[PDB]
Amino acid sequence: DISNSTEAGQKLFNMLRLGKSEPWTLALENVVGAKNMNVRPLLNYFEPLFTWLKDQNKNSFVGWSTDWS
Amino acid sequence: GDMWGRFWTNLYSLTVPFGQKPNIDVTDAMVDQAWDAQRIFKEAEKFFVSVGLPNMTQGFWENSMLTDPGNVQKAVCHPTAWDLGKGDFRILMCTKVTMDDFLTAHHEMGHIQYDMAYAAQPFLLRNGANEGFHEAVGEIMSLSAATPKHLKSIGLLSPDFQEDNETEINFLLKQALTIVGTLPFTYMLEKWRWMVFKGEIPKDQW
Amino acid sequence: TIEEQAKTFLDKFNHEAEDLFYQSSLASWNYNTNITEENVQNMNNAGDKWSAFLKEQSTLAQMYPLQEIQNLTVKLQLQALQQNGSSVLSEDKSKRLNTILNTMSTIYST
Numbered sequence: 521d522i523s524n525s526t527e528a529g530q531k532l533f534n535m536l537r538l539g540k541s542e543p544w545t546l547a548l549e550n551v552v553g554a555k556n557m558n559v560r561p562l563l564n565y566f567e568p569l570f571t572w573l574k575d576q577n578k579n580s581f582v583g584w585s586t587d588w589s
Numbered sequence: 590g591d592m593w594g595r596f597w598t599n600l601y602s603l604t605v606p607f608g609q610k611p612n613i614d615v616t617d618a619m620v621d622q623a624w625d626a627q628r629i630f631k632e633a634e635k636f637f638v639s640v641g642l643p644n645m646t647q648g649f650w651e652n653s654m655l656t657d658p659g660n661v662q663k664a665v666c667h668p669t670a671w672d673l674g675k676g677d678f679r680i681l682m683c684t685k686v687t688m689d690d691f692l693t694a695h696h697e698m699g700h701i702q703y704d705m706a707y708a709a710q711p712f713l714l715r716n717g718a719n720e721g722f723h724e725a726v727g728e729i730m731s732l733s734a735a736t737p738k739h740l741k742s743i744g745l746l747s748p749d750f751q752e753d754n755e756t757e758i759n760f761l762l763k764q765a766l767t768i769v770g771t772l773p774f775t776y777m778l779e780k781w782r783w784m785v786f787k788g789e790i791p792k793d794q795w
Numbered sequence: 796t797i798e799e800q801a802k803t804f805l806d807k808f809n810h811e812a813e814d815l816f817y818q819s820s821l822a823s824w825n826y827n828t829n830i831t832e833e834n835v836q837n838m839n840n841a842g843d844k845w846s847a848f849l850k851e852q853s854t855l856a857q858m859y860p861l862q863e864i865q866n867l868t869v870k871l872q873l874q875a876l877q878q879n880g881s882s883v884l885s886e887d888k889s890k891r892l893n894t895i896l897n898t899m900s901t902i903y904s905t
């Protein structure tokens with residue numbers, strides 16, 4: 521929760537007040553530090569669920585066969 | 590869940606991990622404190638000003654539709670923000686004192702706080718850095734106001750309230766049904782269209 | 796001075812763009828907040844009045860060629876008008892297209 525944290529407002533207010541005046545990769549970098557959409561942070565979000573799921577699917581067949589109908 | 594399979598949200602009632610532990614809702618602690626559709630849009634503004642972004646503007650409080658008229662005067666109640674230009678902004682939404690509207694308040698003030706920031710650019714340079722940037726700020730605004738560490742501070746969610754590691758799974762799975770469940774669908778649907786538009790799929794194998 | 800030209804042009808475009816845009820947005824605001832048929836036609840008036848301004852200004856901006864400008868913040872606006880859009884089609888085709896688009900949406904809606 522980013523509330524009450526002013527240094528998290530700067531990192532955001534620097535990307536906002538550009539509109540479209542800059543390439544979107546330069547805008548991204550002003551917040552994240554990279555130049556491309558990354559799928560790593562989406563996987564840190566669902567970590568405590570991924571663990572639990574890997575534990576719940578012990579006795580099942582993770583995957584699917586594309587011929588049953 | 591739904592007609593096409595875009596979102597798997599409606600499968601929640603069949604897959605809730607722990608059906609007994611109920612979710613976190615404050616729709617009721619709100620009515621007990623007389624929370625009208627102005628206490629909400631003040632809590633949102635306070636949230637934003639707390640971060641560092643600026644206040645709202647007078648013209649925002651005057652000419653907005655922060656509650657449905659309901660009389661002979663009708664409207665269209667789909668929530669949204671407006672950037673009419675020249676330096677006035679306004680929100681149009683018929684808000685019911687609820688929780689899902691306590692989130693949409695932050696979602697929309699997100700757009701408004703985006704627009705107020707780049708209103709010093711030439712008229713054609715007023716938009717998100719690309720198409721996916723605009724609604725991706727509203728989300729992180731509403732994503733960080735539904736957390737008990739924040740509800741437990743603004744006044745709702747009575748203080749001696751421990752969250753247990755089973756409500757957290759109850760919550761993350763409700764998210765994954767809406768976020769992750771829709772990624773393969775989106776990707777597959779745009780792959781199909783990209784391939785159809787370049788003749789890579791003959792017109793008899795669509 | 797091609798660049799200077801492209802500049803002065805934008806300076807002149809901005810004002811009118813802004814004012815017409817206001818008058819066009821206020822109309823749809825009043826329409827959506829106050830649903831009244833006495834508003835629909837006013838909204839359409841201001842709206843297509845604005846939309847025409849765009850066609851005019853765009854075709855007026857095909858003069859300035861892109862690849863001379865290096866002040867990328869004007870190379871960026873010019874790119875946003877010069878888009879020929881769907882007007883590049885013929886006329887029979889271009890009004891067949893709109894018919895197709897309007898039919899496909901009505902079927903879904905009703």
Ligand SMILES: *[C@@H]1O[C@H](CO)[C@@H](O[C@@H]2O[C@H](CO)[C@@H](O)[C@H](O)[C@H]2NC(C)=O)[C@H](O)[C@H]1NC(C)=O
Nearest residue numbers: 521522523524525639738739740741742743744
């Ligand atoms: C943000 O910080 C302010 C001040 O540091 C917090 O306001 C305090 O909240 C506690 C508990 O709600 C009260 O006991 C204090 O009296 C409050 N002080 C003031 C000056 O209001 C606020 O709760 C914080 N917000 C979050 C979400 O943590």
Ligand SMILES: *[C@@H]1O[C@H](CO)[C@@H](O[C@@H]2O[C@H](CO)[C@@H](O)[C@H](O)[C@H]2NC(C)=O)[C@H](O)[C@H]1NC(C)=O
Nearest residue numbers: 568571572575606607753754755756757758759
């Ligand atoms: C929540 O945390 C508790 C404890 O931190 C977990 O309970 C223990 O889990 C271990 C792991 O298998 C068991 O061996 C113990 O018997 C459990 N203790 C009790 C008292 O039952 C619990 O599994 C966690 N829940 C989730 C959903 O992760």
Ligand SMILES: *[C@@H]1O[C@H](CO)[C@@H](O[C@@H]2O[C@H](CO)[C@@H](O)[C@H](O)[C@H]2NC(C)=O)[C@H](O)[C@H]1NC(C)=O
Nearest residue numbers: 658662663825826828829830831832833834835
């Ligand atoms: C909703 O729109 C109607 C007209 O579409 C407005 O009616 C006008 O009301 C003013 C006084 O308030 C009169 O002077 C006008 O003659 C009325 N116009 C018509 C066509 O009758 C009505 O006021 C609007 N409602 C709100 C809340 O602004």
Ligand SMILES: *[C@@H]1O[C@H](CO)[C@@H](O[C@@H]2O[C@H](CO)[C@@H](O)[C@H](O)[C@H]2NC(C)=O)[C@H](O)[C@H]1NC(C)=O
Nearest residue numbers: 709711801802803805806865866867868869870
């Ligand atoms: C591109 O041209 C614009 C002019 O339209 C330049 O912006 C001006 O910069 C000066 C000096 O900073 C300011 O005094 C003016 O107010 C600016 N114009 C406007 C309309 O505000 C811009 O600097 C040029 N690009 C570069 C890289 O210099």
Ligand SMILES: *[C@@H]1O[C@H](CO)[C@@H](O[C@@H]2O[C@H](CO)[C@@H](O)[C@H](O)[C@H]2NC(C)=O)[C@H](O)[C@H]1NC(C)=O
Nearest residue numbers: 854855857858861874876877878879880882883
């Ligand atoms: C936009 O469309 C026009 C056609 O109306 C393209 O062709 C140019 O049209 C102008 C007249 O407005 C002529 O003066 C030019 O000579 C035409 N181009 C050439 C190469 O002869 C125009 O090129 C299109 N521009 C873009 C950016 O799509």
Ligand SMILES: *[C@@H]1O[C@H](CO)[C@@H](O)[C@H](O)[C@H]1NC(C)=O
Nearest residue numbers: 634635638641642643644645
């Ligand atoms: C925001 O508005 C409030 C009005 O209640 C005012 O007291 C406060 O000073 C404003 N914030 C800033 C940073 O000026």
Ligand SMILES: [Zn+2]
Nearest residue numbers: 696700724727
């Ligand atoms: Zn939004």
